[PDB]
Symmetry: C2
Subunit: 408 residues, 2 copies
């Protein structure tokens, strides 16, 4: 009986698959932009766990500022050289010290050391061929603010925070064939199973998908680790080996479509100018990176779907509307898309400033129905799903801190 | 050429119930970074042209602003901690004299730091670039394979540096024009000279619901020009009236509400006061490609590209060229009779000439009682016209005749 501003509307347009063209991009884990997103969010999570240990609540912070400066290297067949380390600057702000006037005590939290440690551990986790001791410099200019113990006491209540702004979030489901193919391609090429078989495949993998009717062209930029290819011959074999595996993958999840696969199209086998790297990432020299310039929270870049321009990674998981709403929108859309009769679902949430974040000014649910289905039969199920997620909005916070949802 | 044209049968933008549009003004920390990034690129282009008569490889689309600290006060406050800015990205740092067998270093560092400081002085009137701002530089040499692609056919038609897409659309909706022109007006020299209290950090958000547009402005006020809270209120109300008169010009028929600095607390005198005219002094951070698209707007009800045009080289970086190109094509197609709305998406393939996109995608919402088959060939010609004159895009960018944010 709790009445929210939820809107369910029938959408009478062509579903995504029936539209003639589609363009989808994904920047893989080792791409400099995705490295920065990953670090930003890993630092946030680390700081959250820090605050939770000491106070049992999360204090205010935002670490959605991370700059990766390309290093210096000299790739060579058989093994190249890393000349200058990658430089990474951690920025943002985080609550550092707590002033307690009553008991006359001052607590200070390991903001800087936690941040640097978290960033370094994330790099070790994803980049197989980067020695973080010598190949990376992690610097930190995160602001260290103070806070009254009184406000900490209020935070420990863990009530639903009030929306500090009029902001929005957007999501949709399900993923189209192209979207699924782009996503799973990057995931597969960065899976441990494949790396074991083809160690030459670096983590800096970028996948572009172009659908023309029922034909999908995949264009892949794949950084090759030079110590695993002793000449151009072996380099070529890596490309064709990967190609065949991606062909097999496309036949599993995009059967019925015509699939074309292009890899490292900028290569020139004649001049021996190819996508060769020492560390398996263009972060080593070729390409710089920063936060919020790549994937959206659903892990994709989709100019045929609605996209928020806000960078979710590193944002305050407590009271940043944009981050929470973009994740929540994608969680709601995903569940509604499972409902019988729903072919396509779009969710948009708009906050009411001054009101709890789970009491939005408007939540729009647009549904393309399957044939012979009545939107009015779906609507009550859909509104229930939305209200359920809104009721459990604090659990969504936990999911983020526990890394159970993606921010890029 | 791979030019695709489609009729798009959806509700036009103005007829949609809800519309949200944002613009970050020139003084906003994110737009500062975008502007600095492009200023560095333009400067390096000029420097390379002077020494070699050609533009050498670079991509300075990386600028990080770490917020400083300040202490604003009625009549004039003071900075406490300087604003740290890091110039980053790629550039041709040196050339090898194979004949003399010596490396010759190019003035990238001095050129970049100078271009950065000059831009700040141009967009932030009340900043002291000596004590308020620190500008560091870590621009480095680009990879060997990237420079190779850049040099393969620079003399002919350049080869795409990468596989990327830009987007564009036309025309602008009433809400979009209102947001865009609101910021531009308040950040115009004519206005700021009239009302020196108006800082350049102006964020404008437009929320349309039906035929009602709520215009929300966050405007930094320069504290040296407001002696008290009363004078502060006078600035707010004076700007408000200016925006009202503007709304009557370009948003006739719409109920336009105007909210300025909604977080202000007049009782506690806790308002949007600044020393420098930017929230960069308030510990707020900024970086490149976190704000406006090349059309100058953030538009979730429109298609967008995540590529950041600012700082990228105007020679072979499709992430810049195609976003500018898509906008140019969209504008022309929108002029055609029968075209209500136009959407242009241009995809590259790394290694292929920039005038040979993997796909040049066009969508058109036709006016009522208009055939797409009549408009279709008109659209292709416009697209072909521009691809034939793709080198003019570089020219327009280097000559600073187009915005990147």
């Amino acid at each position: 009986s709790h009445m929210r501003n939820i809107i369910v509307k029938k959408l009478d347009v062509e579903p995504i698959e029936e539209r003639p063209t589609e363009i989808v991009e994904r920047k893989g884990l080792g791409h400099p932009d995705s490295i920065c997103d990953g670090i930003a969010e890993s630092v946030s999570r680390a700081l959250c766990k820090m605050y939770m240990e000491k106070f049992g609540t999360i204090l205010h912070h935002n670490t959605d500022q991370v700059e990766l400066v390309g290093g210096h290297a000299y790739p060579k067949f058989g093994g190249g050289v890393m000349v200058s380390p990658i430089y990474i600057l951690l920025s943002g702000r985080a609550t550092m010290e707590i002033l307690d006037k009553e008991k006359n005590e001052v607590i200070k939290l390991p903001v800087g050391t936690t941040a640097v440690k978290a960033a370094k551990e994330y790099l070790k986790k994803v980049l197989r061929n980067v020695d973080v001791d010598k190949d990376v410099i992690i610097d930190c200019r995160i602001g260290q603010g103070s806070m009254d113990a009184v406000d900490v006491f209020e935070r420990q209540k863990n009530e639903v925070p009030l929306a500090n702004d009029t902001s929005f979030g957007v999501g949709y489901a399900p993923l189209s064939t192209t979207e699924r193919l782009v996503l799973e391609t990057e995931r597969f090429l960065n899976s441990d199973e494949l790396k074991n078989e083809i160690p030459a495949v670096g983590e800096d993998i970028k996948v572009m998908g172009l659908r023309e009717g029922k034909k999908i062209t995949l264009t892949i930029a794949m950084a090759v680790v030079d110590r695993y290819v002793k000449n151009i011959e072996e380099y070529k074999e890596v490309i064709e080996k990967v190609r065949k595996k991606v062909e097999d993958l496309a036949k599993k999840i995009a059967d019925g479509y015509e699939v074309e696969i292009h890899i490292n199209t900028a290569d020139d086998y004649e001049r021996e100018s190819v996508y060769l790297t020492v560390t398996g990432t263009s972060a080593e020299m070729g390409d710089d990176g920063s936060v919020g310039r790549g994937n959206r929270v659903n892990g994709l870049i989709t100019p045929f779907r609605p996209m928020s321009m806000e960078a979710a990674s590193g944002k305050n998981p407590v009271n940043h509307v944009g981050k929470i709403y973009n994740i929540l929108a994608n969680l709601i859309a995903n569940d509604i898309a499972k409902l019988e009769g729903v072919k396509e679902c779009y969710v948009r949430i708009l906050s009411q400033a001054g009101k709890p974040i789970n009491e939005p000014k408007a939540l729009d649910i647009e549904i393309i129905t399957e044939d012979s289905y009545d939107i009015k039969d779906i609507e009550p199920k859909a509104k229930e799903i939305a209200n359920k997620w809104l009721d459990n909005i604090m659990e969504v916070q936990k999911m983020i801190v526990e890394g159970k949802v993606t921010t890029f």
